Each structure stands twice: as structure tokens, then as C-alpha cells.
């Protein structure tokens with residue numbers, strides 16, 4: 001609501017444009033944030049709304065030199081497809097192959113000596129003093145290459161040089177221009193002086209530079225396109241046509257229509273045939289069927305659906321034809337929300353990613369300075385102290401004087417050094433790994449958002465679980481109802497009816513269960529009236545019940561915890577004090593009933609802890625992560641459930657009001673704490689925590705407090721979320737090393753420092769060793785896709801043997 005804009009930018013090729021754009025925008029006044037995604041080719045900028053407008057931002061971007069526009073909503077396939085660039089680079093490589101074969105054949109013909117040559121390689125027979133026929137062929141071919149093959153690089157360098165910054169094609173244009181001009185000058189000098197020998201010239205490298213450049217830039221885009229498979233599959237999964245039906249009286253088909261999604265609205269009725277996708281989320285009206293959504297939520301078992309259930313826009317129907325009423329259409333569907341969340345997942349760049357952006361904006365000038373320094377130092381060392389170099393070039397050649405060999409060596413070693421740098425491999429090391437990790441997570445239910453939580457989960461030491469809806473099933477079962485007061489004037493029917501009618505006003509999770517229970521044993525569909533319903537969260541409810549004859553034909557009611565009756569001034573007895581103890585330490589909480597000050601009786605209410613809770617708590621304990629449980633229930637109830645799962649420290653009697661101070665005090669020691677909440681209920685608690693985990697939120701992934709969202713209601717996915725985040729963060733570190741070892745080794749070698757050992761590279765060898773670098777970085781990222789989701793028996797394996805039981809004695813409780 002702060003005028004936060006999202007833009008799409010076309011034309012970002014080099015990895016150095018991101019730093020330029022971000023610095024130019026942030027340095028401009030009135031802007032506090034700017035994130036640019038090279039892979040997605042978009043931008044996310046927030047600013048002060050009144051000072052500047054979106055058109056001003058577009059104008060600034062156009063001034064920088066990029067074409068930008070407002071973000072579109074549905075069309076994203078071509079951005080993530082990379083079709084145009086792959087096709088163009090493949091076409092360019094095939095086009096440039098026609099001039100790489102002849103020069104390569106001529107070069108290889110020179111090297112291998114024939115055992116019985118026809119004339120002993122007279123292909124270098126001079127015709128005009130200084131101009132051999134070989135050099136004529138090479139000159140013609142190189143002129144055609146420069147006037148026909150390097151045009152695109154010339155255009156890119158010209159458009160980048162119009163502004164202060166320099167992209168990565170400057171290196172290519174400089175290399176080719178120098179290798180052309182020096183050779184042309186030396187050839188003209190040789191011809192004019194009428195020398196007998198044609199000097200060795202630099203007319204062979206431009207033909208071999210462009211072939212390797214195009215091959216590298218084609219393979220690199222072909223490898224990139226495999227990183228966006230998850231987004232491509234998710235986006236190209238929603239349907240575009242629906243079968244609109246109209247119901248006369250008894251859901252009878254009046255008529256049929258086919259409508260696009262942009263015209264269908266909420267409340268419409270649509271039918272699906274077997275084998276067809278559900279176009280819109282909605283409520284099942286009639287018909288029994290079952291559908292599988294393994295491409296949406298990641299589960300393998302196909303869910304069964306009955307009239308009155310919900311559907312997911314994207315699942316495939318199997319049995320029969322079913323009519324449903326549309327509820328969410330368009331951007332409101334779960335699939336659209338998932339796609340959007342994953343899209344802005346690659347926007348919050350990590351600090352290491354920001355450093356990598358900063359380093360790659362100051363790379364090309366560094367390479368140019370290093371190349372010029374190498375050229376000058378080689379010339380001066382050759383011209384001043386020839387002894388050191390002639391120790392390794394001792395041969396005296398009459399055809400070319402020793403002055404001319406030093407210059408040629410200096411030029412060769414100053415061209416190879418700037419022809420071997422690979423800024424792109426350093427630029428795209430981390431973004432590809434981040435994208436692949438997020439996609440492989442999203443295809444498994446875990447819905448990690450943002451790049452910061454990726455490395456946040458690496459160093460978390462304490463995890464925090466809530467009780468209801470997170471550890472246990474969340475749908476409580478009523479065990480039994482006990483009566484403590486009178487039986488004649490307070491029969492079972494009366495007390496259950498009045499408590500059910502009293503709680504019917506409320507919506508607290510445990511009370512709806514007891515109300516529906518009361519309905520099911522009394523068998524009465526009617527109910528009375530409740531008035532003066534005082535509802536204090538975390539304390540209890542107090543009210544009065546009227547119209548008590550509705551159910552009894554077949555009243556100040558105070559319901560709450562023990563202190564709730566203390567607040568209303570009700571006495572303390574001993575038989576009631578140990579009444580729930582028989583059940584309280586068995587893991588079922590108990591609610592006490594007192595109407596008009598009369599201790600009517602007690603009810604035991606239970607909710608079963610999920611099976612997975614036994615192992616998920618232990619794996620984190622063995623993985624090096626501590627665990628703490630928090631709840632607002634009684635201390636004895638927390639103690640019982642803590643032992644059943646194995647958490648030593650618990651925070652009980654926490655009223656739902658504060659629930660942030662306990663998180664606050666844990667973070668006060670400098671450690672990192674992440675809480676596993678439930679969603680809309682515990683939004684303030686998740687936001688304060690460093691990483692928010694929202695578990696069991698099906699088709700409600702639009703959560704802003706939490707930075708990690710889990711669709712399936714499984715505690716083991718918490719383990720997989722941490723276990724997969726570590727496996728990703730390690731990949732950036734490995735990727736950022738291969739881009740530094742290669743550069744800090746390929747520069748000295750191309751600088752000719754290894755001359756005494758006797759290893760020197762011609763420039764064409766300085767490009768074939770660069771195209772392999774860019775692809776190798778991407779190929780190291782794609783290895784993450786080989787990730788099998790661990791199964792229940794998988795965790796049973798490494799956890800087998802050692803499961804240490806614990807008793808309530810070694811269980812601490814809260815403080816204050």
C-alpha cells in the first residue's frame with residue numbers, strides 16, 4: 001500500500017547490469033529498496049508514493065538504457081522459456097561454423113608432418129615479398145569474420161559504451177580488435193620493407209574465438225532453461241476453458257456454455273468430464289469421485305472427494321461427471337498464489353548474493369587493467385633485460401630479430417589474459433542454485449519463500465512448537481461426561497443441553513467438539529438460547545442460558561479453567577481437585593462445569609497426538625537443534641504430552657495475549673529461534689521469530705508473517721525443510737569457489753607467468769576453457785534435481801536402535 005511497484009525489464013544480458021541498475025536507483029533520493037532478478041528479468045522497487053511516480057521510474061530505467069514496463073499477470077511462459085535466445089545462439093553458432101572449419105583444417109595441416117609429403121607443405125609459398133598465400137587466405141577469412149560475425153558484439157559494446165558502465169562484450173571486442181590491428185600493421189610493415197619472410201600473424205584467432213563464444217553461450221542458455229522446469233510445469237498446468245451449466249430447479253442442466261477464465265466469475269456452476277482438469281476452485285455439489293494433485297501438493301495418494309468437499313484448480317478428475325459451484329476464480333486460486341509466491345521467492349537476495357553482485361560490477365575494468373599492465377610489463381622486461389627471457393628463448397632467428405619476438409609474445413599474452421576471464425560464471429553462480437533449490441522444494445510440498453530464509457535455516461539452533469493444530473490432530477474427541485452435583489434436579493440431559501447451547505455462541509476448537517457430541521447423544525436437532533456470553537480468551541466463558549425446554553422435553557453458566565471459577569468466586573474442593581488427575585496426566589485436558597454456582601460435573605476432552613510427532617522431535621535433537629513446546633493449558637496437561645513426544649522444556653499457562661515475550665527472551669541471548677505455528681492464529685508470534693513456519697495450511701498459502709509455508713500436515717516436512725536448506729546453502733559456497741579458483745588460476749597462466757615451466761596458450765585456447773566454465777557452474781546447480789524425498793522408513797533407519805525414553809521427572813516448566 002506504500003506504492004510498492006513491480007516491473008519487468010527486457011534486455012539484461014550481462015550480470016553486471018544488476019549492480020548498475022540497483023546502485024542508480026538506490027542512490028536516487030526517495031527510494032529505500034531495489035531488488036532485480038536477472039533470471040526472471042523483473043524488478044521490485046518500493047518508494048515514497050507522493051515524491052515520484054511509476055512513470056518516473058520507467059523514465060529513469062529508459063535513461064539507463066533498458067526497456068521496462070508494468071508487470072503483467074498471466075503471461076510468463078516466454079520469460080522462463082529462454083526459447084528466443086537459445087534459437088538465436090544456435091543459429092549464430094551454425095552460421096559461424098562455416099568459417100571455423102576451413103581455418104581449423106589449415107591450422108591442423110600445418111602441425112602434422114606428412115611421412116612422405118607431396119611437396120613438404122608448400123602452402124606457405126611466398127609470392128610477393130612479405131605476403132605469403134597462407135596469410136592472404138587468413139586475411140580474407142578474418143576480414144569476412146570481422147565484418148560479418150562480430151557485428152552483434154560490436155552493437156552490444158557500442159550500446160554499453162554510450163553509458164559509464166561496461167558489459168562483458170567489451171572484452172571480446174577489445175580482444176578481436178587488437179588481434180586484428182596488430183597483425184594488419186605487422187603485415188603491412190613486412191610488405192612495405194620488402195622482407196623475404198612472412199611473419200606469423202594474428203589472423204587465426206578471430207575465426208576460432210567466435211565459434212567457441214557462440215557454442216558456450218548456446219550451451220549455457222540450454223542449461224539455464226532446465227532450471228525453470230518447476231515454474232514452467234506449474235504455470236502451464238491451469239486450464240483456460242470451462243463448461244458452464246445452469247440449474248433449473250433440481251440441478252437440472254438447462255444449457256451448456258464454454259467460457260474463458262477472464263469472463264467466468266464467482267458463483268457460477270461448472271461441470272467436468274472424467275479426465276478433465278478442474279478449472280476453478282469451488283465446493284463439490286453432487287457426485288462421488290476422486291482426484292490426484294501430485295503436481296500441486298506433491299502427495300502420491302489420490303484424495304477421495306464427496307459432495308460437500310473442496311477441490312483444487314489444477315487437479316485431474318477420474319470418475320464420472322461432477323458439478324461444483326465456483327468460489328475462487330483467477331488470481332484467487334491456490335495454484336496462482338503458489339506460482340506468485342515462488343516468483344517473488346527469487347527476489348529477496350541474500351547478503352552473500354549482494355556481495356556477489358557487488359564484486360561482479362567491478363570485474364571488467366579490473367581485467368582490462370590487468371591486461372594492459374601485463375602488456376606493458378612484458379614489453380619493458382623484454383626491451384630492458386633480454387637475458388631472462390632469452391634464457392627460455394635461446395634460439396637466434398635471422399628471419400625475425402629478437403625485438404619482434406618480445407612484442408609478439410607480449411601481445412599474445414595480453415590478449416589471452418582478457419580472452420580467458422569469465423564474468424558470467426561468477427555472476428550466475430548463486431541465482432541458479434537458489435532457483436533450483438526453491439523449485440525442488442516447491443515440488444515436494446515445502447514452499448520456502450525468499451532467499452534470506454534459505455541461509456537463515458542453516459544456523460538455527462532452537463525450534464519452537466505450539467500444541468494444538470501443530471503437534472496433535474486438532475479435532476478433539478470427547479471421552480466422557482461426569483456429574484458432580486445433583487442428579488434429580490440436574491439430570492444428564494439438562495446439563496449437556498445447557499452447556500451445548502451456551503457454547504454454541506463460541507467457536508473455540510474444543511467447545512465445538514463438545515457441542516456436536518452433545519447433539520449426537522441427545523439426538524435433538526434443536527437448541528435453546530444463550531445470553532450475556534462473556535468470552536475471555538485463554539480464561540473461559542461465562543453466560544446465562546434461556547429457553548431450556550427445547551431439549552429437556554425429549555442459569556448463569558460459567559465454563560473455563562480452574563482460575564476462571566476463581567475469578568467468579570467459586571470455592572475449592574478436594575474431590576474435584578483430583579477428579580481430572582486420573583485423566584489429566586494421561587494427556588487429555590478436562591473442562592469443569594459450574595452453573596449458578598453449582599458444581600454440576602466434569603468432562604474429559606482428548607485430542608490424539610499425531611504419529612509423526614514421535615520421530616520429528618528426535619531427529620532435530622540428534623541434528624543439533626533444541627526443541628521447546630509452548631501452550632496455554634494447565635501444567636499437568638503439558639507435562640503429560642511433553643513426555644509422550646520427548647520435549648524436556650515446556651512453556652505452559654501462557655495466555656494467548658502475550659505469546660511473544662517468551663520468543664523475545666529466547667532471542668535475547670543472541671541465538672536464532674524459529675517457531676512452528678499454525679497460520680492465521682499465531683501471526684504475531686511467527687513475525688517476531690527469525691523464521692516463521694506455517695504448518696497445516698492447505699489452500700491458504702497467502703501468509704505474510706511466515707517465511708516457510710507447508711501445505712501437507714506433516715511434521716517430518718519440518719525436518720525436510722531444514723535438511724534441504726542446508727543442502728542448498730552449501731551449493732552456493734561450492735559454486736562461488738569454482739568461479740574463483742578458475743579465475744585466479746586462469747589469469748596467471750594466460751599472463752605467461754608459467755613460461756619457465758613451458759606452458760603457453762594461444763588465444764583460441766583461452767576461450768574454449770571459458771565456455772566450459774560457464775556451463776560447469778550451471779551443471780553443478782542442476783545436480784540438486786537428483787533429490788529423492790526421504791520416506792518414513794528412511795527416518796526409521798538412521799533413528800533405529802537408540803530412542804531414549806524420558807519420565808516427567810526430567811521435564812522442566814516455564815518461569816514466572
Ligand SMILES: [Pt+2]
Nearest residue numbers: 168171172421
Ligand atoms: Pt569474455
